[PDB]
Structure 1
Amino acid sequence: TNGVGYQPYRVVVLSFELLHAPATVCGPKKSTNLVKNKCVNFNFNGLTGT
């Protein structure tokens, strides 16, 4: 019966703090398919090379 202005905005203020208890809410990876017998570049657990 009141207005949408009063209708609650379901609010999640993402309070996050940095550089303590080492970074744990993190960014994922996107994979590919394996290739063989081809001079290519690669990335494995941070390790990168060709």
Structure 2
Amino acid sequence: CYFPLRSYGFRPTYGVGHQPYRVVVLSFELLHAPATVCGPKKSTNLVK
């Protein structure tokens, strides 16, 4: 029995699938109230 399980032996030259790969995740389900992130929406030159 243990509470944790040990943090990994992160040795570089051994680590192949076993080295630390930092990861990030985006979630954006909408279905709520206002607008908050609405893309770059670029602008073309003004013709006259």
User: TM-score scaled to structure 2, two decimals?
Assistant: 0.49
**Which structure features the higher share of strand residues?**
1
User: TM-score scaled to structure 1, two decimals?
Assistant: 0.48
